[PDB]
Amino acid sequence: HMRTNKDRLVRISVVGEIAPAKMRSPYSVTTEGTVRVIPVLGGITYNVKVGDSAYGWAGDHVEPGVSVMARRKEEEIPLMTLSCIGNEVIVMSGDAKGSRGFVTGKHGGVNHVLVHFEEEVLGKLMVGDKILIKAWGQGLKLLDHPDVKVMNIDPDLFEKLGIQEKNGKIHVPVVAKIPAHMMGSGIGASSSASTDYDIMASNPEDLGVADLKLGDIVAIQDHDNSYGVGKYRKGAVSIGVVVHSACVSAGHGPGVVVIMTGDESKILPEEVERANISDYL
Amino acid sequence: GHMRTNKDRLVRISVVGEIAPAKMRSPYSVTTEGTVRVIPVLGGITYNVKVGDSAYGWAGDHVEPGVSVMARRKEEEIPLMTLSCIGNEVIVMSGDAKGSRGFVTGKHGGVNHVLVHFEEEVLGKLMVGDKILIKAWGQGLKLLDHPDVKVMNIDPDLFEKLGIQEKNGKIHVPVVAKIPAHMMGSGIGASSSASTDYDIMASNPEDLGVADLKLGDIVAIQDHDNSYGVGKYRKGAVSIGVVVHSACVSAGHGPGVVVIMTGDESKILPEEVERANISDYLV
Amino acid sequence: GHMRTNKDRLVRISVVGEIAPAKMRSPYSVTTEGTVRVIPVLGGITYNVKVGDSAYGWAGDHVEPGVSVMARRKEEEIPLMTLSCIGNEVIVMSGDAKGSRGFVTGKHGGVNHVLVHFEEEVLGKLMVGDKILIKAWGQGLKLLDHPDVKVMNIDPDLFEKLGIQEKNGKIHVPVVAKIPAHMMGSGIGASSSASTDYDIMASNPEDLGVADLKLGDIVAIQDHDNSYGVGKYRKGAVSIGVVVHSACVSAGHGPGVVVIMTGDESKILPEEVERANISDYL
Amino acid sequence: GHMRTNKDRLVRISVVGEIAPAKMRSPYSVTTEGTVRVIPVLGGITYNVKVGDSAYGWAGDHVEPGVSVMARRKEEEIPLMTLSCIGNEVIVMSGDAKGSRGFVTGKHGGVNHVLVHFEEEVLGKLMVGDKILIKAWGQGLKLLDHPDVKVMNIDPDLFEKLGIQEKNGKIHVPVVAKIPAHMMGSGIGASSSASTDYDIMASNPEDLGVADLKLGDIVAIQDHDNSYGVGKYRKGAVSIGVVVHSACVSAGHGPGVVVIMTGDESKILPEEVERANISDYL
Amino acid sequence: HMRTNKDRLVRISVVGEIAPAKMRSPYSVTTEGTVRVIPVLGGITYNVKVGDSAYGWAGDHVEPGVSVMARRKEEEIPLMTLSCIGNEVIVMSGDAKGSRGFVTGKHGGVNHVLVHFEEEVLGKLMVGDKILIKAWGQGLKLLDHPDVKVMNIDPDLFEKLGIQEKNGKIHVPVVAKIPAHMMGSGIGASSSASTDYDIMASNPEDLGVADLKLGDIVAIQDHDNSYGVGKYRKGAVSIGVVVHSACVSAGHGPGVVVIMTGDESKILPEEVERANISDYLV
């Protein structure tokens, strides 16, 4: 139990609706300059869920579970900014009205918040159904570690990640440690609070692991995410969550939402067999 | 045996639309003879034309069987048309027939409608504008032992019921007709065979050497490759498709075909049978 | 005893709209005398005026009996107006009168309304904007033994009730009046007779040689061909139509007529009767 | 020695547009092999490609020779595409090349461009958005002694220079190639042959049995009737057209053809020559 | 001089207009989470030009010379795709009408093409003035080096970069070799033909050099740019041109437009004191 400002934090209604499956072209362009016709992002994805492999799908940018978009452009920034991984989500219209889930991730660009509901719910949902996220976590501070920034994470979920304070150093279980040069699309976004960015590994063996799963906790080496996304800084480290599937185009791959950032003197990622948010929700 | 596929890597996703109105841009349809007729066209809930019926003998043009489903907005057309596969499950999500289930029978480019079969009882309860969920599944499908035979636009479970067989490294496919390249018209050159149909421009089924061509029929198209864009003429290529809409009165138009398979004549052997119609595995 | 038709080749399709508001572009209607009157006009649920009533004797202009049905949007107007046939079944799909059934009595071009008769009890439950389904059926209808006699705008089952008879390779049609070409005004020239009405510009029914002209009445128009566009003057042509809206106050307007049959006087013999009104066959 | 025409009954009218930008909906063009290329496409002032040049051998897709002319707005696209005939006079009405004159070489449907040849000196003074006047003339043209041979899309004065000859109640037409029906792709089914081109989907000119196919070339299309809509397969029909745009990389596309004549093989006898190219008759 | 396909290449009018200076906020957010009020991108920038340091200006994303934007959104793709570094630019309206310049770079997101004119021209220019780019270079291939891709570069300017063939390998003068990890904003764009991407060096010394100048030729180690932008692959190498100034926000820095990409076994960057396109535009 780290000391935080949890009691100072503001909890607020963030609304959206279930997003349709989205495609701007039938074709996805590969790194080899070839075209494939495959499903992409958005929608209710019936057979890909948090906890599944990010790899091995005939798809691109596939978002697990339910994708939630804004009612209109003006409402995209708060949706994307305030929604934190692990926040409670309630279905507010349609046949699954009253059903509860949790935020697994968010994806910038199209600006989707990604949500896990129990399987039985998914078959009752419809594109356009109203969604309430009870947004809570931005503003979170570690009072004993002011140089370690945290974000994008529900404070109750934060306490279940196996993070231990030992000797003024913050030990964090991770499945993999990713070099700065493996990060691609999304570097330079205005705020790490409001988007993911991509690990451009075409295969999980490129990251030194047999598999990378949606919901996995990873370390990003030599990236500072305190403000904008993806600042290369030797000795910086970031901790994040894997939020979407593998991708076919140059510079893309499984998305990561940052939950912690600071110096390698303070944050010690420790490689374990399993570290996945699906285990706690 | 069972064709080896990548079925388990396939993504299943919600594709949304709404029941389309009957659409007409003019009261008149222009014939091949340069005359005008006033007849029903595409869109809507068509009450007396269904998958399994003849594509011919209707006083109509581009008539779409059953329920025509359009996008909620233009931006949603590409996924509707691309991801929706013949045989996919369809659920009515608003109106008096809410909870009713049907199947995708076809899709038609231009207006960009996905065509759906529901049991006859359901049709009398439907209303234009009613919300429609397609549980889209099939794009990405590969035959793991036949890499040079491309498949598309087809629900994997429905694909298994088409009487298709592996032998001697070749795929045998039952069809009602084999259609020459020169009989294909409107829709050649579309960007992607995954997202449209193209027309057989036969005025009469006898022009194809058959007594009838029915909505839902499986046909072969000779000397057309449909791997990427639509309707590349190539000597020795063969495509398999499904008939999806009715006969048409204007030059270059006729019953629509959605391609489900394409490759080389050395690998795909269409074999002419009396009956090969998806309604047998769907109505 | 039916005429041979291609009825079985005809396509039945959903045509949608919604109950139209009462519409007025000005408070005033301009008369043929160049004066102004403030009176109700077209659109709406008209509580007071119905198929079978006189087209004359109302303090109103272009009054549409029963329920006026318009398109959801402009792009849907053509199929609404083209495919909807007199006598087609109509079903209320939203609001308090949801499930109620009626019949198309007519259609009026310009504002593009299809006009619908429901039972009187229904009207008081209806609201402007309530959703309407027309089960459109009849366009494409051909008389297989009379290829030169064109039919349109008419539900085939209603067509069989009009007292029309084959004899000697000709068609006898009961009508209340036969209207000269020069009595037809507004709507001549419309692209298609399938998609609109045109006006009988008689100020009084006596101008037509009859004591009354009623909404629903079956009439002949002499020397007009309506095979394609509306109102082609041709000596010896004859058209048959149905009266669909009320008398009118402005020059060139009057009770509207939707054409259901057109051909030559050698083939179509209108025969004047006391009564020929579609309300009798609801 | 002219054919008898209704030339004097034809209406000459102003058709306007403006110089179109280069247009691309994606940086990539998708090939028949399912790969992507980044290359120039249609629209614009193409400095480098002109009527008379090969339709093949460019690193490009749908490249339109000379100056591409589009409509000021969507509502003006139909008359632009319909009335503009190959060989019509074109006048620059604004910008630095104001007063310069050129000739219509073709037109391309979809984006709806009319393609124009100006002298080379003019091109360097032109700007996208400069105003363009086409003196449209030729739609309505009939061959008075060959009623079953339809002509279209062609300036009558240009028509007289094509080496076409009457003999024995038949029409002999010089062509560089005769193209089978099955070689025609994109554009089949368009409402009207008067308002668009359609594509020869040959990847290489050798697929057509010729060493080269040039922009401006006169070709025959075997077994296609183009009297009304585009590309009706009919055994024994023959069409004559002009090649109007470059080879293409996607399935079902290739050099575009605007039809100028259509009828039966009993009346129209295409005769293969070494050269038949409209650039010779500017 | 390398064998190319220069002869198949299409040259086409790409238009735009001079862009205003653009700011979405008065504040620019730094890597330290502070705000500064400083000039940004767009406009005619009077005192920053190709050849100047990318660093040491109190500004963010500063674009040298004249920033050119599309007339409308639909025209952005061709502007950004077809415009090649070194292409000729002609002013088509305003007080400097007829003045010629050269493309120095392009910048994705806002989608500006950057242009160098002689200094005297700049004082005559106005935001909104019409701009013609004679676009030429996309489609360029090295016929003897099929696995070395080139792009975004005027073929004549390409021949001035001191690039030499020896032993089936390509030697390229560069001022710096930049590690993959120093590349940020713009990775993952659909096409390297239509955007730049950022070197996120806060200071030039972060790249092992005293200075990095606008117009500098650089190597990016372990990035493949054949299709989409910034694919990390060990052993790939890309060559690019520095196109805009240093940036204050995380993940941004001087922008690079890629002109060549391939394998380290074929492309040999060689570090020199000076390699800058300002030495050769004209």
Ligand SMILES: [Cl-]
């Ligand atoms: Cl999930």
Ligand SMILES: [Cl-]
């Ligand atoms: Cl690194």
Ligand SMILES: [Cl-]
């Ligand atoms: Cl059906």
Ligand SMILES: [Cl-]
């Ligand atoms: Cl194979």
Ligand SMILES: [Cl-]
């Ligand atoms: Cl053939």
Ligand SMILES: [Cl-]
């Ligand atoms: Cl009534």
Ligand SMILES: [Cl-]
């Ligand atoms: Cl009164």
Ligand SMILES: [Cl-]
């Ligand atoms: Cl008269």
Ligand SMILES: [Cl-]
């Ligand atoms: Cl030209």
Ligand SMILES: [Cl-]
């Ligand atoms: Cl090439």
Ligand SMILES: [Cl-]
């Ligand atoms: Cl053929």
Ligand SMILES: [Cl-]
């Ligand atoms: Cl400059």
Ligand SMILES: [K+]
């Ligand atoms: K999803």
Ligand SMILES: [K+]
């Ligand atoms: K339908």
Ligand SMILES: [K+]
């Ligand atoms: K009414």
Ligand SMILES: [K+]
């Ligand atoms: K051009």
